[PDB]
Write a protein that binds this ligand. Structure first.
Ligand SMILES: [Ca+2]
Ligand SMILES: [Ca+2]
Length: 269
């Protein structure tokens, strides 16, 4: 029995699936705690930049969960990703405690750029600016990677790093009423929002779990970006970013919502 998580429907990913767009041939790096083998996931490869964790498997759960929102397989089990044919790469930059260093994150962004990733999902933050982080972001972006990052779960009216840097697409979280989730950070730099409450996805152990956070919102956008790239293979990171905002459903102040709610139907028309 396959279920479709509410968020996947809300961004209207199955309309895009019906048009034949599933993210096929699009390479997506998940910079997180790793990704575990799972019957509803296909991992094409990856790299670890965590000291003394040479494998890319997930000892936390967060990365596996984020990965399934992007690319859970279309079949008779589990859930369904926004872009269920995307090519998933596990880039481990966070440890089991869900924490890492800017050194690790930057090395991951370097690798993504160097290995031709189209999209880099960064469901993570730093509260404090880091030059190393911003140059890493800038670097990946000039190589052609589209960097998507979580705004943060503190509830404040400013957003975390590296989401706050110009070349990273900043994603906040909405609830089932399409309101801003109380924890979702907002303010200057916010680009767009996506479902981030009660998000069911894949979890280590061959199982499924429901989590809340802007970390859960971000992969909806990463997924939607892979659909736009399959339909428009010559488009740049910047064209995709702009088209997602331009086609999003408007929710009110840009301070709070960015351009609004990502809409995969409208972006693949
Ligand atoms: Ca499935
Ligand atoms: Ca930004």
């Amino acid at each position: 029995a396959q279920s479709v998580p509410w968020g996947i429907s809300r961004v209207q990913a199955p309309a895009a699936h019906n048009r034949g767009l599933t993210g096929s041939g699009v390479k997506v790096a998940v910079l997180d705690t790793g990704i575990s083998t799972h019957p509803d996931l296909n991992i094409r490869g990856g790299a670890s930049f965590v000291p003394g964790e040479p494998s890319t498997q997930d000892g936390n759960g967060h990365g596996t969960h984020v990965a399934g929102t992007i690319a859970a397989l279309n079949n008779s089990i589990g859930v369904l990703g926004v872009a269920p044919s995307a090519e998933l790469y596990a880039v481990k930059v966070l440890g089991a405690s869900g924490s890492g260093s800017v050194s690790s994150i930057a090395q991951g962004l370097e690798w993504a750029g160097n290995n031709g990733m189209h999209v880099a999902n960064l469901s993570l933050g730093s509260p404090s600016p880091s030059a190393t982080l911003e140059q890493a972001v800038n670097s990946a972006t000039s190589r052609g990677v589209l960097v998507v990052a979580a705004s943060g779960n503190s509830g404040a009216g400013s957003i975390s790093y590296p989401a706050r840097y110009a070349n990273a697409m900043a994603v906040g979280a909405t609830d089932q009423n399409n309101n801003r989730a109380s924890f979702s950070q907002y303010g200057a730099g916010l680009d767009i929002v996506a479902p981030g409450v009660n998000v069911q996805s894949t979890y280590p152990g061959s199982t499924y779990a429901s989590l809340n956070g802007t970390s859960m919102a971000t992969p909806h956008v990463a997924g939607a970006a892979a659909l736009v790239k399959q339909k428009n293979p010559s488009w740049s990171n910047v064209q995709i970013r702009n088209h997602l905002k331009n086609t999003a459903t408007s929710l009110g102040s840009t301070n709070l919502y960015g351009s609004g709610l990502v809409n995969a139907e409208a972006a693949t028309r």
